[PDB]
Design a binder for this molecule. Structure first.
Ligand SMILES: Nc1nc2c(ncn2[C@@H]2O[C@H](COP(=O)(O)OP(=O)(O)NP(=O)(O)O)[C@@H](O)[C@H]2O)c(=O)[nH]1
Ligand SMILES: Nc1nc2c(ncn2[C@@H]2O[C@H](COP(=O)(O)OP(=O)(O)NP(=O)(O)O)[C@@H](O)[C@H]2O)c(=O)[nH]1
Ligand SMILES: Nc1nc2c(ncn2[C@@H]2O[C@H](COP(=O)(O)OP(=O)(O)NP(=O)(O)O)[C@@H](O)[C@H]2O)c(=O)[nH]1
Ligand SMILES: [Mg+2]
Ligand SMILES: [Mg+2]
Ligand SMILES: [Mg+2]
Ligand SMILES: [Mg+2]
Lengths: 248, 248, 248
């Protein structure tokens, strides 16, 4: 037996607490349950649509995610609203924290005639996708196996960012804290280029080494924030069109 | 042209003889037919739900499988009863004998609104899955190509067994016949730990080096037989939920 | 920014010009448009069902393909007639020119109850498959990302040809122009063995080093042309049965 700390992260109303209660066998606050190989400390985090805030029940999950307290995340995704839910999923995968997708509410998806190829999605994301109906306890055993087996997400180029955006993000990834892993550093630097207020606190040579970067791009990109978000949305649409019935 | 000996193995009533008659062009007992690269000697084996018997038209297929007479198996699986049929399939894949899944009765599956992602299943099993309707001769040519191309199953950890169970299975895999390949030895040792009566005959330091093993686990596992079977069933459920419409 | 020359190739009436107009933003003849990384010169080629003619709006596309003018192809495939469209696709993949499948008319496929697993098809073909509805501009952004990311098709044995056919094709691949890459040479040699009239012009030791080859096979294959075509059709049927609802 090894120890694992796992965070439940997902949009508001995606079924995180329901899944929490199922795993921990809660009576009708950290949880603890056993898998085959792990004693898992489980943290139910407040819902969030995104790890980016430009101005402001959480940016609590983000701060929790970046604290290094979690070894792995369970990203709870509502299957009936896939494309909307996948924005947060992509941010987590760009960050590189080991994760498993708990693709929840599949009974609701089925009622609305939504079809998702589970393993196709997993191969596009580079992490396991475990189908669940959390209210029914369906898929929990498979989720527990995936927590014992998953070690690291696949190293995919997920989002296809214009090279000028990555040049200037990577320069910032060179300034900052250096302790903090490269994947996280480039992520922090794109978050900075989007106008995220919380990410400078995690830098090193921190804040407005950003003003040089954001001016180094006027010959190239008009609104970097909009270009970064758009590249993300494009990626998610391409995934949903391939693995789901969303194209038509 | 090379020679191949192929066994047809599957549950009772899965379409083995029908497929046999199609491949051999039998008139309305070993068969022989040509693929592009092989002269195939085909053996129609008696149906079985499982290669485990704790007390007792076959354990004939099992004895045939373990004799080394077959180079490859065609595992004939009834698509309309996937989860039930996959128990035998998993045993064959744990054994490691080269195999191809002939996913038969897909017309019946379709009538009962069963949807199976063929290549997703193949990637989860680690061997080719060839969709058939054997009564219609549909898929036979693709099956023949797969017999020429398939060499070895992928080396996947299929079933996620508690480590104490594998410790004690592997010790037995150390005793026995040593001629007999490691994959087959660990398989024989888990079969022993489940109470299979036929597997001691295939050991070496044979039988009740099992009593030491089965007592070496009372600090850990209550009923090893039940724990092994459950791990298997869990694996199969996880596969069917991902690649089929069984979750909901 | 790098330069790319891309040919649009596909059967008559598969939506090539529609896709051309969408990419180039044509007003209601080469095009030019930007992707993230490339300035793409786009060539709308005349439709063709096949790159083989034994006797004779094109063999223009074939001559264009073999000229080396295109860096990459977009193979425009009508999803509502997959199996028929895939004959040309296979020829292109056997040739080895970098390509992306634009799986078009998916709205029509959906109306006729056709289901295609997009990523399963991509893995069977060894190149990206981008789902489109070209009249709606749906999927164009994902297509543009794929043109920036795709470098080389996967090196799969697609079609399972009787070894005598490949022996004699490869001997011819030894004669010819030697400048011309091995994959293209074997392709030219199978085209010769099928009776293609245009391929001798691209040989070296050219034409009727074919008469020796075609007589070197009477102990083995009756009609090599029919055997080659059949192997191709078999391959396509096997693909469609796995990734589409065509088996039953
Ligand atoms: N039909 C169905 N409903 C579900 C499933 N999972 C959760 N729910 C329902 O969805 C509701 C919201 O679930 P809950 O566990 O509180 O969500 P949460 O994501 O913890 N939301 P919050 O961010 O407000 O904490 C609950 O009524 C629960 O019963 C599911 O798989 N299917
Ligand atoms: N609709 C349909 N029926 C099939 C198909 N394959 C086999 N059958 C039918 O299923 C029945 C049982 O088939 P058979 O070939 O004897 O099965 P077997 O697996 O050899 N059974 P046994 O273990 O008793 O030897 C036969 O009537 C056959 O016609 C299939 O693809 N679709
Ligand atoms: N419903 C639907 N129709 C489409 C789509 N793509 C093209 N079409 C329609 O199909 C017709 C034929 O398209 P077009 O672009 O000329 O095809 P082409 O493959 O260039 N044919 P040609 O070989 O004759 O050049 C046009 O009326 C177009 O509107 C699609 O995704 N869905
Ligand atoms: Mg909650
Ligand atoms: Mg029979
Ligand atoms: Mg699939
Ligand atoms: Mg046209």
């Amino acid at each position: 037996m090894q120890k694992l700390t796992v965070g439940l992260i997902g949009n508001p109303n995606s079924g995180k607490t329901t899944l929490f209660n199922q795993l921990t066998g809660a009576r009708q606050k950290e949880g603890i349950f056993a898998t085959t190989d792990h004693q898992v400390t489980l943290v139910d985090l407040p819902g969030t649509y995104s790890l980016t805030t430009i101005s402001s029940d959480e940016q609590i999950a983000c701060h929790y995610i970046l604290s290094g307290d979690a070894d792995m995340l369970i990203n709870v995704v509502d299957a009936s609203n896939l494309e909307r839910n996948l924005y947060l999923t992509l941010q987590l995968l760009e960050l590189g924290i080991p994760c498993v997708v708990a693709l929840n509410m599949l009974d609701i998806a089925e009622k609305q005639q939504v079809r998702i190829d589970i393993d196709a999605l997993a191969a596009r994301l580079g992490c396991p996708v475990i189908p669940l109906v959390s209210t029914r306890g369906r898929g929990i055993e498979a989720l527990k196996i995936a927590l014992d087996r998953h070690q690291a997400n696949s190293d995919l180029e997920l989002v296809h960012y214009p090279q000028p955006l990555l040049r200037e993000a990577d320069l910032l990834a060179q300034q900052m804290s250096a302790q903090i892993p490269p994947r996280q550093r480039r992520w922090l630097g794109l978050q900075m280029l989007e106008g995220d207020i919380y990410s400078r606190a995690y830098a090193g040579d921190a804040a407005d080494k950003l003003d040089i970067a954001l001016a180094n791009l006027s010959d190239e990109i008009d609104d970097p924030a909009l270009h970064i978000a758009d590249a993300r949305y494009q990626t998610i649409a391409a995934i949903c069109d391939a693995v789901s019935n969303t194209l038509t």
